[PDB]
Write a protein that binds this ligand. Sequence first.
Ligand SMILES: *[C@@H]1O[C@H](CO)[C@@H](O[C@@H]2O[C@H](CO)[C@@H](O)[C@H](O)[C@H]2NC(C)=O)[C@H](O)[C@H]1NC(C)=O
Ligand SMILES: *[C@@H]1O[C@H](CO)[C@@H](O)[C@H](O)[C@H]1NC(C)=O
Ligand SMILES: *[C@@H]1O[C@H](CO)[C@@H](O)[C@H](O)[C@H]1NC(C)=O
Length: 438
Amino acid sequence: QQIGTLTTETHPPLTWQTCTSGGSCTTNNGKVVLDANWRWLHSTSGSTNCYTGNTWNTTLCPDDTTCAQNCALDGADYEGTYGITASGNSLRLNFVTNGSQKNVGSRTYLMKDDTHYQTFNLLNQEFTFDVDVSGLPCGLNGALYMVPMAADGGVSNEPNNKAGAQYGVGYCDSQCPRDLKFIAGSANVQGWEPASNSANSGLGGNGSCCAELDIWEANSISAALTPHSADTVTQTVCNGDDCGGTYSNDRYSGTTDPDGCDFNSYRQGDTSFYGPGKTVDTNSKFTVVTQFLTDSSGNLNEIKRFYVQNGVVIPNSQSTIAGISGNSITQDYCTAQKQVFGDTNTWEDHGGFQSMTNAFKAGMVLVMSLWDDYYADMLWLDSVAYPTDADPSTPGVARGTCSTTSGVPSDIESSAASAYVIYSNIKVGPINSTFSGT
Ligand SMILES: *[C@@H]1O[C@H](CO)[C@@H](O[C@@H]2O[C@H](CO)[C@@H](O)[C@H](O)[C@H]2NC(C)=O)[C@H](O)[C@H]1NC(C)=O
Ligand SMILES: *[C@@H]1O[C@H](CO)[C@@H](O)[C@H](O)[C@H]1NC(C)=O
Ligand SMILES: *[C@@H]1O[C@H](CO)[C@@H](O)[C@H](O)[C@H]1NC(C)=O
């Protein structure tokens, strides 16, 4: 994709902190950038759209290469168009913004400078942040996570990609998404079909695969921490159903792990721990600490979770499912959890902990998003039963308090139009350097 010249692209400033062993922390001057899929895409020769709503202009885009040559991503009005506002160390994302047009959700990335994403290697470190999910009802997902996207957005070896990280280009994740308009420096017009339900999306012939660390996927009802492995941890391109993942006809046939090794306190049998008025009270802001412990050789072997709220340091809840003990993500837990729930261990199949270790060494980009789910209505995160026809007596089926008919986008984009999430006070450093409490 080309650089559009009709609207200035200004990345909203966002501060975050780096801490060292002593507990002392310094402030970084970061910036946020909107993912390329949300942007206006128009001709390099004027204002004619290359894409509108769910449909490509086939004169401007008769093939994937020519499209990339002809089409430019332009600047975004973060607050007015997308409901994205950054102030100090705080990033707020609104679910629905009714400006001149209707916008639903957003996906943003943390930048080091105006043409490079910030990268993280969190091995033997912790990533910590505050969040307010009180405005997130059933069906919403405020996600804060990491993927090994190229720091420059792909420009160094993609001749038709000039827009790069400056315009939020380069997304990949563990579902090998095919809804991306631009993948590895080519458009995705070939094979494109508009979505059956979503006015503003579709799927193309190719998908964008990489490893994915879902540090945080949550609403006011439930939360999940889920690493996902991949054969090759950085971006690879796939075609059609061989991609695997959500919109494939054969979910587990690809080169990535679409399910991950998840820890949702509710799914692990504790319904009293996280939610409204619970031990982690989603009525109020709380701190989320995620620690990445290593073996003697520097490979990842455990992800621990702590919360801080109202001054109290709260350990992660123990899994109470018979055969699945502990409160952290380890190889023992992942093995046990997949065996006991009867889920396919694609986490292990694509390299597991060694894969995530490789992902961190390659460098992870921080992603902060808010979305609804046209595929499964976020029932995997918050439903009384997923699948909706499964027996709630069977361990692993129940994930939250939401009904099996909750979270339908056409419903919630109206009924939850005021929904939002606020991520704030990001801190990174050695284990136990980023937080304190009783
Ligand atoms: C991107 O996906 C498109 C669509 O599937 C692929 O285009 C096909 O390419 C094959 C091989 O050249 C042709 O036989 C077909 O005619 C194309 N199909 C369509 C619908 O145009 C393209 O190969 C993919 N890109 C990559 C890098 O795999
Ligand atoms: C597609 O782009 C061409 C070239 O700019 C333009 O003339 C035409 O009106 C566009 N077609 C549609 C259907 O938008
Ligand atoms: C860090 O803090 C946790 C929570 O209090 C504690 O369990 C652990 O022993 C500490 N580890 C280190 C390396 O300081």
